[PDB]
Every structure is written in C-alpha cells, then in structure tokens.
Amino acid sequence: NVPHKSSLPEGIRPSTVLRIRGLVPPNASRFHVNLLCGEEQGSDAALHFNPRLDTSEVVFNSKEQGSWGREERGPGVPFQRGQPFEVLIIASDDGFKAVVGDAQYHHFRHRLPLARVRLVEVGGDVQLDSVRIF
Amino acid sequence: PHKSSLPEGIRPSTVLRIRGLVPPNASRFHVNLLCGEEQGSDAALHFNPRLDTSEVVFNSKEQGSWGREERGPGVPFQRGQPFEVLIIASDDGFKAVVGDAQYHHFRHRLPLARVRLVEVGGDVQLDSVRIF
C-alpha cells in the first residue's frame, strides 16, 4: 500500500478533489498525505496533512526549500485505530478543504501556488484502500 | 422529492456528495441544480440517469424550455445496487463522478452564481446528501 505516490505531471487545477480511503491499523502512530511539487527528495510540500493518533492531533503544515512553515491544527483527531476512513482534499482557489467522514474538518489556506503541485504521496502507519483524483 | 436550499449559492470547487441505491424495478431518477425556490425555475444542471433506455442524460432548462441534451457513455447505475455520485463545480462546468471514475463533464450553460437549490427526486432511494 504505502508509500503510495500519484504523479500529476499536468498538475492539479482548482476544484480538483482528492479522495483517500483506507484503514487506520491497530497500534498506528501517525500517517501523512503530502502534496509535493516534484518527484525529487525534499521537494516543496504545498500541503502536509498529518493525522497523529499517538498524540491525538491533526497537523497541517507546508515546506518550502527545506523549511517547514507554522503548523495549523484541526479540532481533534477524526480517526481511530481499527476504523476505516474517507478523506476528501478539495483544492479551491483559496486553499485546501479537508473533509473527513461526513463533515468538513479544516480549511488550509494556500501558502504555495496550487499550480506547483505535481505529486500526491501517502505514507506512515496507514493501510490504503484507494487514492483517486477527480 | 428531497430538496436542499443554498442561500449564498455555490462557488467553484464545491462538491456535492450523493449516496443511495436504485429500487429493483426503477426506471429513471434525477438530480437538479435550480436557480431558485420557485417552481419551474431555470436549471443549470439536469443529471438524469436512464436505466430503462440504458443511458444518462445531461441538460439544462432555461426560460422553461430544455436545451440540447448531452449523454454520457452507457449507464453506470445497475438496478438494485448502491451508488455514490459526486458533482464537482468548477470554473468550466460540472464534473459528474460516479463510483470511482469521472463519468461526464457538463460545461456551464447558465452562470454558476445563480444556483440556489439542489433537488433530488425520481426512482431513487436517497440515503444522504452532503455539500462540501
């Protein structure tokens, strides 16, 4: 399953929807969904979606030229060890809408131009069902 | 006969998630994006899967009259089986997603800023409708 990579050579425009489905395994610690600007190592991360079950948090951040931005946090962790999940990452002109389950979870304002995203990466302690880009 | 009101309309990058299942002896159902609460109001999108004819019709009703019909490949709705529909609004049009693949791209004919209501009716058992 992981590390899972979906290459977007043409990039993603606004109104693109990332649908991520999978299971949070028993004893999971944390996993991540990255929107990177390239296939190379250390590429700029327009979005770092990092649910942390060991600390019961979800961290949002970006990375530009090796430096991490300031972390944002959503209301609690909407994931459970031993439970499946469905995440929507909806890219708008203003930013990324993160939907978990049946409710909007957090809006991450754009820190990098959306037109730079060219890679979706899923890693960490997660057993992926499917990654689909609409 | 389910309706969902939208007072401030829908901006681009709006997602409409529809979940449900078609009855075993069902023919056709629809999802409409109307321009107001009034009856017979203009429709920016008409999403009408046709199971008896094995087709899916896209159209728009303007000034009371229907426009030129568009049709998607085949029908991704099997009788007696559940489904999940996404209608994604962009600057260019509506991306209709069925299942795990994009089914059709309906380019805007009416201004998106006019959509004020989402109505789902016909031969469909509606389980949940969410707007993100």
Author numbering:
A (entry chain A): 2 to 135
B (entry chain B): 4 to 135
Excerpt from the paper describing this PDB structure:
For example, while extracellular GAL-7 can trigger apoptosis of activated T cells following binding to glycoreceptors via its GBS, it can also bind E-cadherin on epithelial cells independently of its GBS. In this work, we studied the impact of homodimer interface mutations on the induction of Jurkat T cell apoptosis, allowing us to positively and negatively modulate the biological activity of GAL-7 by designing a covalent disulfide bridge (G16C) and destabilizing mutation (G16S) to control homodimer strength, stability, and biological activity.
Based on our computational predictions, mutations G16S and F135S should weaken GAL-7 homodimer interactions, while formation of a disulfide bridge in G16C could strengthen protomer interactions and favor GAL-7 homodimer stability. We found that both G16C and G16S variants maintain GAL-7 dimer architecture in solution, unlike other protomer interface mutations that likely perturb the hydrophobic core of the dimer interface, resulting in insoluble constructs (e.g., F135S). In contrast, the G16S variant displays 32-fold lower dimer affinity relative to WT GAL-7 (KD = 1.88 μM), indicative of significant homodimer destabilization induced by the mutation. Conversely, the G16S mutation weakens GAL-7 stability, inducing a 9.1 °C decrease in melting temperature. Our results show that the G16S mutation decreases the proapoptotic activity of GAL-7, yielding an EC50 of 13.7 μM (95% confidence interval [CI95%] between 10.2 and 18.3 μM) relative to 8.4 μM (CI95% 7.6–9.1 μM) for WT GAL-7. One of the most significant structural rearrangements between WT and G16X apo structures occurs in the local environment of residues 8–17 (loop 1), which exhibit significant atomic-scale deviations in the variants. This local rearrangement of loop 1 involves Gly16 and its neighboring residues, particularly residues Pro10, Glu11, Gly12, and Arg14.
